[PDB]
Design a protein around this ligand. Structure first.
Ligand SMILES: CSc1ccccc1[C@H]1CCCN1C(=O)CNC(=O)NCc1ccc(N)cc1
Length: 164
């Protein structure tokens, strides 16, 4: 079946809790596999110890830049970038997990979790999963954001991996 992966999140060193995600490998196997491997760190690099660098309330929480820590970096398990796999899943509501990008066919490692229906991103960002458990943790992260994206606390993925 589809992989389940987790992110354990801290804010200013204080544990917020765990987010569990289903990766829709049945629909986007290449994109799901990239995220899964970056969660386990099995290639020698990954999300562990990286941060949520842009958080905008009533929009999304963005993370995954483990190279530059500012939204300019990250890489995939395939190379620096890989193509948009398909746009079959939509941004249907809160909890949707989607690839951040810098235009068509520039997927790397950066991702976001939506806190509302962001239907205007349909066809532009590849949706590849959703939150199974821990929307309360997501809502906490959201609360530390601002209109500009700057966080008022340092939000760290302290651990991550695969559950099944
Ligand atoms: C103000 S944030 C924003 C605004 C309009 C549309 C999209 C967004 C944010 C959250 C939804 C995801 N997103 C972006 O992807 C904005 N782009 C980037 O942050 N690009 C930086 C970047 C991303 C991926 C890669 N591989 C390299 C650089």
């Amino acid at each position: 079946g589809n992989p389940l992966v987790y992110l354990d999140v801290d804010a200013n060193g204080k544990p917020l809790g765990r987010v569990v995600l289903e990766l829709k490998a049945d629909v986007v196997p290449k994109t799901a596999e990239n995220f899964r491997a970056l969660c386990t760190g099995e290639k020698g690099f990954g999300y562990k110890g990286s941060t949520f660098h842009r958080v905008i309330p009533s929009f999304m929480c963005q993370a995954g830049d483990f190279t530059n820590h500012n939204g300019t970096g990250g890489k995939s398990i395939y190379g620096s970038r890989f193509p948009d796999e398909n746009f079959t899943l939509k941004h249907v509501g809160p909890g949707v997990l989607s690839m951040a990008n810098a235009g068509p066919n520039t997927n790397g490692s950066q991702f976001f979790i939506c806190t509302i229906k962001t239907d205007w991103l349909d066809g532009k960002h590849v949706v590849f999963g959703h939150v199974i458990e821990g929307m309360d943790v997501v809502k906490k992260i959201e609360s530390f954001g601002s209109k500009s994206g700057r966080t008022s606390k340092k939000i760290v993925i302290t651990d991550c991996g695969q559950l099944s």
